[PDB]
Amino acid sequence: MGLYRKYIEYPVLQKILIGLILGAIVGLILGHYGYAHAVHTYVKPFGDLFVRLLKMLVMPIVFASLVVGAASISPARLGRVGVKIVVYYLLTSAFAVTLGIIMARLFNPGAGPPLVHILLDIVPTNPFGALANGQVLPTIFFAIILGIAITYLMNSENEKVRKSAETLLDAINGLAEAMYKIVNGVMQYAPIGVFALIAYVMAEQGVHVVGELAKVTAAVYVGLTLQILLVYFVLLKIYGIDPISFIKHAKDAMLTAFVTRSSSGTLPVTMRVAKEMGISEGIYSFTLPLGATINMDGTALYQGVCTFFIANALGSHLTVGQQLTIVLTAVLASIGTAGVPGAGAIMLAMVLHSVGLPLTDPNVAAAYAMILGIDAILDMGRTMVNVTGDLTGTAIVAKTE
């Protein structure tokens, strides 16, 4: 076709980066000349199509890949990896949100759920209904249950049941391997989408990011970088794995999660960098699709610093906010959020409705609107630390096995 084949000749991460750079440059130039409605009605629909594709991909890829993932064995490896991976994700997410409580105290703010039905909603009251209407967490539950039942059926004695279980597992594996090819097809289109998205985001609200609300995003970025270098480095340093080689060996997945702003949009490159890391296929194949959508350390560290930006601009106080329930509801919102770009803001609204200062006041929508505008640049570092937390967990359970 001509220049199209040269466009599918470049490597991907030497192209999404040039899209981000030439999006931020043209966004700043068109923000210095006041073309904000021009970008918002001409260039932003490409980024909205990109976000539409990354939302489309998440629901088959969290079901079929997770059913295939729960086919190592039923008892031993699955049980031990399950317990020592969910408690690992819980401690990493809780340490991230208590770092967020630690943050915005050395840093500054910017001036200018019935508590058991949330856990009972994990069990889906209808599996196809909880697969249609979003609901990533009950889809995860039903997918793990179906995987365990399929790996029980494959060890049966009747030949017809064995053939039927093998055919069902091969069908779901065909869907889970077709969704990765659709991910590759989307991430070929990705530089146009990230160009449009960062162009609009730098144009509309990002023109004054460094003037005011610079200390909140400085708090987010310094907290995420210190989260990396003070949790993941020490967790690789406990179990005897050199972590600078871990960054230089997983920088592929780190960078594509940094630019595409989706944890579940970087699942194939995270799987290929685990195999290029050589973790082992049977030991990552369950915990990477689980960890892609059950632990988000970026949103966990992000909800605390967002609630401290809102509550310390014009809010009640910090100890009247009762930070322990902020930690708990932020861990729950990190667990229950999806892997799309603009996901954690809605769960942040859920956190604020659940802990205090709900979204009805005339001085809470004005603080939330600025962070809804600036959410798109924080999503980058959020998904970056999420995918490298997944990779860190896979390397840890590679060590203790």
Ligand X SMILES: CCCCCCCC/C=C\CCCCCCCC(=O)O[C@H](COC(=O)CCCCCCCCCCCCCCC)COP(=O)(O)OCCN
List residues near ligand ASP by CB under 6 A: 261-263, 296, 298-299, 337, 339-344, 379, 382-383, 386
Based on the shown chain and the rule CB under 6 A, indicate whether residue 184 belongs to the binding site for ligand X: yes
Select from ligand X, ligand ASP, none the partner in contact with residue 262, using the beta carbon and a kind-dependent cut-off of 5 to 8 Å.
ligand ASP
Our CB check for ligand X shows the closer of 70 and 197 to be: 197
Count of C-beta atoms within a 10 Å radius of residue 174: 12
Which of the stretches 17-25, 130-138, 179-187, 213-221 binds ligand X when contact is defined by CB under 6 A?
179-187
- CB 186, min distance to ligand X, A: 5
Report the alpha-carbon distance of residue 303 to residue 101 in Å, rounded.
10
Sorted by sequence, the CB contacts under 8 Å of residue 165 that are 6+ apart come out as 150, 153, 154, 156
Indicate the angle between helix axes 287-294 and 58-69, nearest 10 degrees: 140
Select from ligand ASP, ligand X, none the partner in contact with residue 7, using the beta carbon and a kind-dependent cut-off of 5 to 8 Å.
ligand X
Based on the shown chain and the rule CB under 6 A, indicate whether residue 182 belongs to the binding site for ligand X: yes
What SS3 state is found at 358? coil
Cα(first)–Cα(last) distance of the chain, in Å? 50
Report the alpha-carbon distance of residue 345 to residue 14 in Å, rounded.
30
- CB 382, min distance to ligand X, A: 24
Based on the shown chain and the rule CB under 6 A, indicate whether residue 174 belongs to the binding site for ligand X: no
- CB 233, min distance to ligand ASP, A: 22
| Strands in 30-162 per DSSP E | none
- CB 191, min distance to ligand X, A: 7
How many residues bind ligand X (CB under 6 A)? The answer is 9
Select from ligand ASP, ligand X, none the partner in contact with residue 186, using the beta carbon and a kind-dependent cut-off of 5 to 8 Å.
ligand X
Our CB check for ligand X shows the closer of 261 and 382 to be: 261
Report the alpha-carbon distance of residue 75 to residue 219 in Å, rounded.
43
- CB 33, min distance to ligand X, A: 27
* Backbone discontinuities in the chain, residue before each (C to N > 2.5 A): 112
Half-sphere exposure (Cβ direction) of 210: Cα atoms closer than 13 Å:
3
Count of C-beta atoms within a 10 Å radius of residue 359: 13
Select from ligand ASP, ligand X, none the partner in contact with residue 343, using the beta carbon and a kind-dependent cut-off of 5 to 8 Å.
ligand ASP
Rule CB under 6 A: which residues touch ligand X?
Answer: 7-8, 181-182, 184-186, 188-189
